[PDB]
Amino acid sequence: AEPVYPDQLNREEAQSVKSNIVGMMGQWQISGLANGWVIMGPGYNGEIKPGTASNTWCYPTNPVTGEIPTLSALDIPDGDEVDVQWRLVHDSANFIKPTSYLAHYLGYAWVGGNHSQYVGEDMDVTRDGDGWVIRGNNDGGCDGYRCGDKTAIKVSNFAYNLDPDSFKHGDVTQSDRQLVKTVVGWAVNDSDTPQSGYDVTLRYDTATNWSKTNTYGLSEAVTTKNKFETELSIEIAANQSWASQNGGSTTTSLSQSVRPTVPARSKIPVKIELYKADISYPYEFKADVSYDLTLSGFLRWGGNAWYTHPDNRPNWNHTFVIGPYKDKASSIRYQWDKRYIPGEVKWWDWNWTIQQNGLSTMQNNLARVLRPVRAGITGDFSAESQFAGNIEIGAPVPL
Amino acid sequence: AEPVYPDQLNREEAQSVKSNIVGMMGQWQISGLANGWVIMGPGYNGEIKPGTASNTWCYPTNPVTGEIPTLSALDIPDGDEVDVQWRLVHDSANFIKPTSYLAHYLGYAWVGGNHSQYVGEDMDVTRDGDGWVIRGNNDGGCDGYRCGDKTAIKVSNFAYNLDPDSFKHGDVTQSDRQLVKTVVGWAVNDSDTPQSGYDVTLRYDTATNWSKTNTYGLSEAVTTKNKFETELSIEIAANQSWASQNGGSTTTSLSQSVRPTVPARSKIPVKIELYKADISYPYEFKADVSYDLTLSGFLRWGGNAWYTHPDNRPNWNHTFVIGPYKDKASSIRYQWDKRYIPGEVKWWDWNWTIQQNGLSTMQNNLARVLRPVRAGITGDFSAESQFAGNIEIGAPVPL
């Protein structure tokens, strides 16, 4: 009838979340529900049958949805892309601690450095290629099984959601200009009315292609020979062959046209030019910063949140998208909202994290992890071997 | 929290520039910072731990950004491209000395001639192909290890940023004209209204292509023969083959059309012609002159600014772009502004140059190297085997 969330705890509603109810009770115990039905615990394999007992299950008269709250946006002082990234990853209260706690709650081992006993303390930050890496400091020494195998938090693939009325760009400059082709010409009007029916068009195209082929074959031959000085021989033969091909191509095209309106009893000159050149220009906008978050390290033997709950301390890697929806495996909100359907629990078990830490705890942590970020952006565009053109209509000459 | 620039000198802020702080202190020394944390010097490998000591690190209460200043533009008397280049490279106060000092500060050996002891003096200037070369004069003799291996400063790849309302061009002339094709025709209107539904179009296309193929193969055969006068033999065989192809093409197209409006009960004649010809014309504009600067010579054993600090006197080459941003390796402003992030110091160490010469010194030198230049330009366009066309609508004839 209604969706039921196990953290809040009808024969059907009981069946819909059967494995959660059966998990949360003693072996050989029996507890009741509506209309004379009872749930049997482990050892009876969770069987639901008509019956009676001295314990019962029941929902709150007024239960809650348990959704992740939305916080106000975090404003980062303006700059270029790398400066804004620097300011985000070095913020311990708004970035480093919430992310460390998320990794800890999901079951990643050793989230922290050697100079503190607390989660998220004593972390080092470094720049690595186009991304950033946050890991606990490992100077001196530690004490614990595999205590030198720290969990790493990796940040990459930043993207920007612009505000439509904020974008601006500056001067466009060109360098290393090379000529492709030019055309010049005249449009002549010896009639008594204006004429607009003229057209000159110049077009340039380039393309590439590839192909691969596999061939297989068989043949059979029979020869009979008779040496009557004179030998006479006759050969009969046949063959079969099969072949298979795959391929493809890519094409780029650039066209320019001119269509002048010419006054009566007059003529107009025209010109079109095409070059290749490198293009550069500055820009600015205001936007929201989204990114990919990857957690990497071995999981804990005493318990973790992976839905198969492995116990051999495997090394683990998983990527979440902090921002708009792309996919199910990488969406925290998708997985949180659907925790009432056992058939979709394919990645992380969020019911387990609620049981271990409390509902308010998990809600506040996830709200901080998913908080929006605002920042101003300045930057520079640059590209090699692009196109540049020029189309001209000149002044008329009376005939 | 905040970016910290080492020339101006929190446990995190301390970690963000750890290698600069540790470099700038004595082995086995320990100095303090905020909230009970201390930095250990070389020999402790820079370890940051809780503790105490008799020395401390601290930032200025009011530190500076240290950005490179912008100077007013240098005006060069007008001419053509080569005359303006000549005037730029022969200016010792605005060009030769600042560039020589930049090469000297980065660690290039022997920047100067044999008739002076000062940097940038006694330099010769020569024209070489499409560029210019500036090098210290090596007449007579010198005194020093490899003192005859002078550092060279090379200038090439000039580009112009026009002022939109300044461009003008003159007469367009043609020579070596060869006919491609012509068409003539009539548009006839025997209706009682004007008609504009007429079209004649002439189009000419040319193209080239190429392709390469690699093929490999295997075969196996078995023959049985029996010589019962009569020999009978039977052959069974099979084969396999694999092939791979790559290719491409280029196409150029030029089209011309005519669409006349014809009065009622009248006719109009039309004509289209297409030629190949060489095209020439004069031009003028006002613009800014940008260029590529290349430094070439062996580096100094006692210290240089390359980030790996090599000590075997290698021969070195590096190109900077003086002008708008293209890339990171060739941008002085990009590298200067990001000197607070150790993970991006991949080319020249600008913190090292500041430590060796002072901050005001480096700022003034780089401001002079990057100063804008304004100049007027006159010139001539020339190209072979271009297109030229002519489209004509004639006077009407009553029917």
Residue numbers in the entry:
A (entry chain A), B (entry chain B): 1 to 9, 27 to 245, 252 to 422
Provide the publication's sentences verbatim.
Aerolysin is a β-pore-forming toxin produced by most Aeromonas bacteria, which has attracted large attention in the field of nanopore sensing due to its narrow and charged pore lumen. Pore-forming toxins (PFTs) are important virulence factors of many pathogenic bacteria, which are secreted in a soluble form and upon host membrane binding, they oligomerize into transmembrane pores undergoing a complex structural reorganization. Domains 3 and 4 form the 120 Å long 14-stranded β-barrel, with each protomer contributing two antiparallel β-strands.
We have recently demonstrated that the K238A mutation enhances the sensing capabilities and sensitivity due to a longer dwell time of the analyte in the pore. To unravel the structural basis for this improved performance, we have solved the structure of the K238A mutant in SMALP obtaining a density map at 2.2 Å. The structures of the WT and mutant in SMALP are highly similar, exhibiting an RMSD of 0.92 Å and comparable pore cavities shown both from the raw structure and in MD simulations. Upon closer examination of the mutant structure, it becomes evident that the K238A mutation induces widening of the third constriction ring. In contrast to previous suggestions that the K238A mutation alters the analyte dwell time by decreasing the diameter of the constriction formed by R220,13 these structures reveal that all other constriction rings remain unaffected. Notably, for this mutant, we did observe a narrower water density from the MD simulation at R220, which is the same as previous MD results. The new structures indicate that the K238A mutation may influence the pore’s rigidity as it disrupts salt–bridge interactions between K238 and E258 within the barrel. A comparison of the ionic current response to different voltages revealed that the MD simulations in DPhPC bilayers based on the new K238A aerolysin structure solved in SMALPs yielded results that very closely aligned with the experimental data and are better than previous estimations, especially when negative voltage is applied.
